[PDB]
């Protein structure tokens, strides 16, 4: 416990399902600048401040970044006790936040805006930790590859990051279909294993 109560007017507040994360805010016109030097984490909507677990090297200078949320919608049917009581309840439930460096600390307005996907930092709700991602650039072009034809694909619960060229992206149906095929195949085999003739059979 820090033992001092901070002024939160000077801190960015990011809210996750189980925690609130505070990072320092240097003044700027569009509110995009971040200091990773001071950070605190708090139980949800309560005000006893505490120091986060930092699992990686953190930046020592001001960085312009963009924030995104990762999570799952929860739709529940709640009990009905009055005539017009709500039939359904929906909650966002964010679990991780990804902060990505603007390129060369450039600003949105500039014609030259892009995002540096090499530097992405993650905040995790369950572990109260901040870490840096490991990206695998499979895009030829080297370190100098253009940043106007780059796309990042995140898979695996936020644990896999890759940069690939734009045109080689998969359509939305293919991603769903690929997954269903894998699961369905494994499940049929599990069923059919019990039969005494499995060793002598062929998938077709």
């Amino acid at each position: 416990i820090v033992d001092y109560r901070i002024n939160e007017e000077e801190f960015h507040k990011i809210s996750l399902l189980d925690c609130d994360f505070f990072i320092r805010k240097p003044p700027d016109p569009d509110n995009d600048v971040y200091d990773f030097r001071e950070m605190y984490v708090t139980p949800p909507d309560t005000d006893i401040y505490a120091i986060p677990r930092v699992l990686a090297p953190m930046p020592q200078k001001y960085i312009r970044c963009a924030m995104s949320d990762y999570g799952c919608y929860n739709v529940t049917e709640p009990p009905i006790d009055a005539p017009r009581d709500p039939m359904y309840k929906s909650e966002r439930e964010v679990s991780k936040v990804f902060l990505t460096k603007h390129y060369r600390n450039r600003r949105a307005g500039d014609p030259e805006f892009a995002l540096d996907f090499e530097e992405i930092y993650v905040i995790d709700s369950k572990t109260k930790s901040i870490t840096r991602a490991k990206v695998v650039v499979t895009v030829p072009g080297g370190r100098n590859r253009d940043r106007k034809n780059d796309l990042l694909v995140i898979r695996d619960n936020g644990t896999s990051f890759k940069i690939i060229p734009s045109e080689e992206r998969d359509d939305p149906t293919t991603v769903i279909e690929k997954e269903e095929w894998k699961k369905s195949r494994q499940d049929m085999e599990r069923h059919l294993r019990k039969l005494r003739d499995f060793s002598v059979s062929n998938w077709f």
Binding site: E118, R132, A133, K134, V135, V137
Partner: peptide
């Protein structure tokens, strides 16, 4: 140059 963080 490159950290463990970025791999090509």
């Amino acid at each position: 140059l490159s950290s463990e963080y970025v791999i090509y």
